[PDB]
Amino acid sequence: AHFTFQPEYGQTQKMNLFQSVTSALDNSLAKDPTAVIFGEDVAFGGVFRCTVGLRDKYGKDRVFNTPLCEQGIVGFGIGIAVTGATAIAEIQFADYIFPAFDQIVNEAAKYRYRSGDLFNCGSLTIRSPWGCVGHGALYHSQSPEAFFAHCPGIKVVIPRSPFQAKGLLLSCIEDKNPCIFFEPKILYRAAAEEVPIEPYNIPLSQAEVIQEGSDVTLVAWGTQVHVIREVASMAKEKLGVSCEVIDLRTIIPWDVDTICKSVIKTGRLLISHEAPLTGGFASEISSTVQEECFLNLEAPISRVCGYDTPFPHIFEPFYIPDKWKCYDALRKMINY
């Protein structure tokens, strides 16, 4: 593996990330009698086991399979939500969210605005496996968040761990705006830690500083947070460099203030993500930070991203923005 995972609220149990998602969905159906979960192959527990046991517990009318049609899954979910009921739609891989792009962008995101708040689909959440998995190639590896970041009216949220995933998913489910929640699939079984059994929330539009530091700010989300945590360790050890490590968590609306506050302190910023460089979300963070922290910047902001190609099968190890690529970019930024 290219990463290493490392691990107030009542009793906890050790959960991997798929189990934390099941736990969030179970808590939601238990407390909200209107909530349903639907999509391809969810009834038997899903292709990644995220819905195991829920149809038996809550009933076939609340956890059910749809026909194989993503534009329909999202349009159907908007309509459930227009009536006020919680609709938790699954899209089987984020790579297959594109047939539903018109329903997300032209419809879900715009529903409240265009009606003057006469109608809305706030009670819709779309959850989808995301990011690279070692051998997923072009259509089981994608990270589509920058496509959605350019659409006002939706929220886009990505967790880095089991504890984070349950708390952020419950916040998505309960938020009054249509939300896309992307689950890093390479963590579904790998990442396991203590997770509260009872429901809890983590706020949206709020980054988390997971390690304080004074020389450079590193920003990432999803599995790539674990990559930059290791990069921070490598920098301390090899270079005597103190890195502030930040998980962005929500892509939009994003926490501009936490990132700028960090860069005002450190003077230096590196952003990293698996998605391609050009048009990726690091470009929005980099310009904004340049706009707000111009006087504090000691070096150009660095973006260490996937290359501008489709996601390859056999060349995956050469494609991803791994710890060596991030480390080397950091070293040059420190030397600048």
Binding site: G77, Y113, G116, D117, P152, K176, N177
Partner: protein, 390 residues
């Protein structure tokens, strides 16, 4: 004898392709002839006088409003308009067969359904003018109506997107034990979109109480139906998805009513979808941006839903020329009163461009709103400010 999971069928030992029946398609259900005469007494709904008068008055008040608003657009007073000419019977015949609280999703050419549900003239005109009375806050193009109180979901321009949405709202109603049906209107061009195949199939497999109502008016802008499909219209598609289907004369308000009323009764009882294809003809231009003579009446003069209904009223002794003349004057006056009021109202405060993007206003969007306010403070003489509230 065949054992396959995907179909229930017998074997056949000879090779035979299944041919579509397109020359002799699904017949067109009719109740009254073009002279307003009931053809088959067993099919007469015998609707009471006051209700048949409401069908008629709704159609003609809509027609009065269409003529005035089309003119207003031609003068540059509103930015866009779409008329309902020729299709007024499909709207009122169907809306009269619904429960008041049945949820409606539409396309853009179904304003008679709102008129039947007593949507105020002031609110049709507020939306077309984008004025302070518009509950849509001036944000959408004209004719993009919506009303939460009358269960009419806001119209949006992207075609067919409401089809799978309507199915989800119907699934939710089933769960809620609502005793409510959802109706979803769309045209024959919209039915070519992938979202129509999504909604039809989901409504059948998830067993939803929904009526799909297709207005087949022969054209989608410039495209005749011969370039839209090659099967027997939209009605012949329903059975393929396992949907009970019917084709009606959309210029016959009673055929439309009967089919809608029976579809509603069975959809709610049985949790199953129904499809009605109402055959009609688009008398108007597609919109104010279209000059339809560039690509194409008997229909206006010889088969019009309003004329057919007027002949029926006369046959019962329920209308006459004196009444016709009085109502034409009163309807013009009512429409002109609302029109004048709408034109004199200001537009909403420009701050409303920023609300309702999300339920709350994110701090970075508030920053943008503040930036506009600062901007107008310095440069406002360059903006049409005296037309906007506050």
């Amino acid at each position: 004898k065949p054992q396959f999971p995907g179909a229930s069928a017998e074997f056949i030992d000879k090779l035979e392709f299944i041919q579509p029946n397109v020359i002799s398609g699904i017949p067109i259900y009719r109740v009254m002839d073009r002279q307003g005469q009931i053809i088959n007494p067993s099919e007469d709904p015998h609707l009471p006088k006051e209700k048949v008068l409401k069908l008629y008055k709704s159609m003609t008040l809509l027609n009065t409003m269409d003529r005035i608003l089309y003119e207003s657009q031609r003068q540059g007073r509103i930015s866009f308009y779409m008329t309902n000419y020729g299709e007024e019977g499909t709207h009122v015949g169907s809306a009269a067969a619904l429960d008041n609280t049945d949820l409606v999703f539409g396309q853009y050419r179904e304003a008679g359904v709102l008129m039947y549900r007593d949507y105020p003239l002031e609110l049709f005109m507020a939306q077309c003018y984008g004025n302070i009375s518009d509950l849509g806050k001036g944000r959408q193009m004209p004719v993009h109506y919506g009303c939460k109180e009358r269960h009419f979901v806001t119209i949006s321009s992207p075609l067919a997107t409401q089809i799978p949405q309507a199915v989800g709202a119907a699934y939710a109603a089933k769960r809620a034990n609502a005793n409510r049906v959802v109706i979803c209107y769309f045209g024959e061009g919209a039915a070519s979109e992938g979202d129509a195949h999504a909604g039809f199939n989901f409504a059948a497999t998830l067993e939803c109480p929904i009526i799909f109502f297709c207005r087949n008016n022969g054209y989608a802008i410039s495209t005749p139906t011969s370039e839209q499909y090659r099967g027997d219209g939209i009605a012949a598609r329903g059975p393929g998805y396992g949907i009970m289907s019917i084709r009606v004369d959309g210029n016959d308000v009673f055929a439309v009513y009967n089919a809608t009323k029976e579809a509603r009764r069975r959809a709610v009882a049985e949790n199953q979808p129904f499809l009605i294809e109402a055959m009609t003809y688009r008398i108007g231009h597609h919109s104010t941006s279209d000059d339809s003579s560039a690509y194409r009446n008997y229909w206006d003069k010889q088969d019009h839903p309003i004329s057919r209904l007027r002949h029926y009223l006369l046959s019962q002794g329920w209308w006459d020329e004196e009444q016709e003349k009085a109502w034409r004057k009163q309807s013009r006056r009512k429409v002109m009163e609302a029109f004048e009021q709408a034109e004199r109202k200001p537009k909403p405060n420009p701050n409303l461009l920023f609300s309702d993007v999300y339920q709350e206003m994110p701090a970075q969007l508030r920053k943008q709103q503040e930036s506009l306010a600062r901007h107008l403070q310095t440069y406002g003489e360059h903006y049409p400010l005296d037309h906007f509230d506050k």
